[PDB]
Structure formats: C-alpha cells, structure tokens
C-alpha cells in the first residue's frame, strides 16, 4: 500500500537527537508531493535528488530519521557541517542523497518552566561516523585526572537538556527534524514513486 509517512511526521512522540529514531520505508509507494506541497515546513532541503523527480524514481533502501533539536542547529543537519549536533549527535554523509525536513514545534515540545526531556550530547572523545548513534551514559574525562565513574573536576556527564520555554527565541525553540535517506543499489527496489506504480 502507500508508504507510512504520517506515522513518521505526525508521530505522537519524537526522540532526542542523541537517541535519534530511524524507520525503514519499504514495500510501499511513496507520494512525496503531499509532503512537498505542505506549507508547514520551515526547511525542505534535498541533496543529490530533486523534490519532483522523486515521484518518478525507485530506490533500494529508504530511511526516515527523526529527532528534535533547536532552531539554530537545523543548519547542522546538512552534509559537510560541523558543530555539537553534527559531530556528537547526528552526522550526515558528504555523499548524502535525500531530503532534510524541519518544522517549528514550539506548541508541542515546550513548557513554561521548560521541557527538559529532550537531550543532546555535548561531550565525546571522537566524532560520530555517518549514521552512528551514541546513547552512552558514561562520564566524560575532559582532562588528565581520571573520573572514577562520578562527575567532578573536568569530569562531566556527557548529556544536557534543552530547556524548551515558549518565550524563547526561534533559534532556541524546538524544531522537529525528519531526514529521508535514499539509497540506490543494483538490487530490488522497496520504494517507488507513484509515476512508476500500479494501483488496483
């Protein structure tokens, strides 16, 4: 049948960027224009593909990665970018083929005192590889003194909370991100646009 896109975009729960979610879209027909027509998206950036030609294309593997970041970090989701989110939370490949979609979610993911249940990693010994996910809770050793497993001098817990308050600036307001990854191999297709599909 049709691809489960509303399940990804309209999901009742979004993950923290450090524990970003992934869904495979497979054995389905993908109506992309219903998402590209929508005027609800602050960002719709496609790399290596065209938002229109997608409906006349077929792909071997398609992944939808979802998470929540703040506005000023949406620029980091693009390929070849640097920063805490790109280096330590969600890295895109330089050969990335797919679209990055974002929308302001202040009405859902913000509370007056602050919604602190959305986390990010600001400390890591190495940079993430493309599409790696790090959900470790180990204390980070920012200096030469070992940490002995507890937070202290130059020994930090590597996760902090976005404080999402409705009065914040848009650059500090929560943004929900969905990343469509498109992969074409010499192998059977699992997702095809409608222009290459048969519907009874």
């Amino acid at each position, epitope marked *: 049948n049709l691809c489960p896109f509303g*399940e990804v975009f309209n*999901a*009742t*729960r*979004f*993950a923290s960027v450090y524990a970003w*979610n*992934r*869904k*495979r*879209i*497979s*054995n389905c027909v993908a109506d992309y224009s219903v998402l590209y027509n929508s005027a609800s998206f602050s960002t719709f950036k496609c790399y290596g593909v065209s938002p229109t030609k997608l409906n006349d294309l077929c792909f071997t593997n398609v*992944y939808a990665d*979802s998470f929540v970041i703040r506005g000023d970090e949406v620029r980091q989701i693009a390929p070849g970018q640097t920063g805490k989110i790109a280096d330590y939370n969600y890295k895109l490949p330089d050969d990335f083929t797919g679209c990055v979609i974002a929308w302001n979610s202040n009405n859902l993911d913000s509370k007056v005192g602050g919604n*602190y*249940n959305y*986390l990010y990693r600001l400390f890591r010994k190495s940079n*993430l*590889k493309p*599409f*790696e*996910r*790090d*959900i*470790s*809770t*180990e*204390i980070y050793q920012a200096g030469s003194t070992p940490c002995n*497993g*507890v*937070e202290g001098f130059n020994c930090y*817990f590597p*996760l*902090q*909370s976005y404080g999402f308050q409705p009065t914040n600036g848009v650059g500090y307001q929560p943004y929900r991100v969905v990343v469509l990854s498109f992969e074409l191999l010499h192998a059977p297709a699992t997702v095809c646009g409608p222009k290459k599909s048969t519907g009874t």
Partner: single-chain antibody, 237 residues
Framework: VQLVQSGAEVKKPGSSVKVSCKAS????????ISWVRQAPGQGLEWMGG????????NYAQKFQGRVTITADESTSTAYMELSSLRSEDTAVYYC?????????????????WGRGTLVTVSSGGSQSVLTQPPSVSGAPGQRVTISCTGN?????????VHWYQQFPGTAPKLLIY???NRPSGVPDRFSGSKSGTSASLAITGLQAEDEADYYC???????????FGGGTKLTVL
C-alpha cells in the same frame, strides 16, 4: 550494583500502587533506572525510566498519564506509581538498569535486574511487536536456534537485538547484548546474529540446564520504546 525492590502488594481495582527500587551503592551514579513489567497475557513490557543525575523521565505510550517515575539521590531510591489499577495490571514488576553504547544501530539493553515486586489487582491480550516461536525442542549435544522476527520499524530499520534468559521462578537475565556479544558468565555455546527483519539466537552443545524461556529485545521507532519478544520455551529432550 544490586537492585533491591519493595514488598508485594495487593490492591483493589481503581487504586494506586507505588513501588521502590534502591541501589546497593547509594549513589545512582550516571545510571538510567528503568521499570520493566511482566503481566500474564501481555508479556514483557517496558514502562519507563529516569536518569536521576538529570531528573529527566521517559514513559511508554501505553502507560503515560497512568505511570509516574521519580528518583531521589539522597535515599538512592527510585519510585514508580501506577494509577487506575485494573485486573490486567497484575504482574511481576521489575527494576532494571538501562545500558547504552555507540554503534550505527545502537539501542538500550537491561543488564542488571531486581528480583521483582509482585502486584496483584483483585476482582484483552497484547500481541508482541517481535515474533518468536512459542516452543522449540532440541536433543542434547546438538545445535538449536530460536528466531525473532521484527517488522520494518525495528529490526528492519537496523536496530540491534538483545536476548534474555529466564528460568522458572527467577527474573530475566541478559544473555546476548548487541547482536552477538556475551556478558561474562554466558557460555560460548550461546551465539547471536541479525539479518534483515529477523534475528537469531543459536545454542550449540545443548544441555538440559539450557531449558528456559528466551526473549528478544529491540527498539521500535513506531512506538518510540523498547520492545520484547513473546518468548520461546526451549525444551531439551
């Protein structure tokens, strides 16, 4: 650490129960304390958890607005309160530590468990997202396998699969973390694998002492939570 839980409680329908989980060390140091339920006809269900050092919470959609999880580093005790109790809520409620790591398909597992607190509510069915055969039989000294078949949302997405071993009268115990890795104390005869939407647990040199229930755990992004399998009773002839 060792996780010690509260005593058994008998409650009436519509009442509320609040159970406690206290750590031996007395620090709750950078740990994530999760609550996993085992209710007849509903299998193993992750309910939620908290990272005490941050105080941030995470609940399962099925129990949200009905469960409340708190932690207090002073007492080194975490609490879980279930409201509007129903007869189906009768279950062995476990407290467990939630571990993490860094790979492309990394997802949490539960390495340390408590004995479990029993809650009986006095006076339908939940189908698992991961499918296992109810029963598998094997002869001693031969190789046996158990299958776990997730949908596109979990194993198809690439999420790793972990395995838990549960003996009669005991609590679930980690057997395989990651797709193939073994905690210390697990024999080399146990092995794991993942391909496509399915995962496998292989036991070689099968012995009578391997006769137990085996579960597979993955992360389902359609539910945004950890999911367990229906369980497989291995029988050694």
């Amino acid at each position: 650490v060792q996780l010690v839980q509260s005593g058994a409680e008998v409650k009436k329908p519509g009442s509320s129960v609040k159970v406690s989980c206290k750590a031996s060390g007395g620090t709750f140091s950078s740990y994530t304390i999760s609550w996993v339920r085992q209710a007849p006809g509903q299998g193993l269900e992750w309910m939620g958890g908290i990272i005490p050092i941050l105080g941030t919470t995470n609940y399962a959609q099925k129990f949200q607005g009905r469960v409340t999880i708190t932690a207090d580093e002073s007492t080194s005790t975490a609490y879980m309160e279930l409201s509007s109790l129903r007869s189906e809520d009768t279950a062995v409620y476990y407290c467990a530590r939630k571990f993490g790591y860094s790979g492309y398909g990394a997802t949490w597992y539960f390495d340390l468990w408590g004995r479990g607190t029993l809650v009986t509510v006095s006076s339908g069915g939940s189908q698992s997202v991961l499918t296992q055969p109810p029963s598998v039989s094997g002869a001693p000294g031969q190789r046996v396998t158990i299958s776990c078949t997730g949908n596109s949302s979990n194993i198809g997405a690439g999420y790793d699969v972990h395995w838990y071993q549960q003996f009669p009268g005991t609590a679930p115990k980690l057997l395989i973390y990651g797709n193939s890795n073994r905690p210390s104390g697990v024999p080399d005869r146990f092995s794991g694998s993942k391909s496509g939407t399915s995962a496998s647990l292989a036991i070689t040199g099968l012995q009578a002492e391997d006769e137990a229930d085996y579960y597979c755990q993955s992360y389902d992004s359609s539910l945004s939570g950890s999911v367990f399998g229906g369980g497989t009773k291995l029988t050694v002839l």
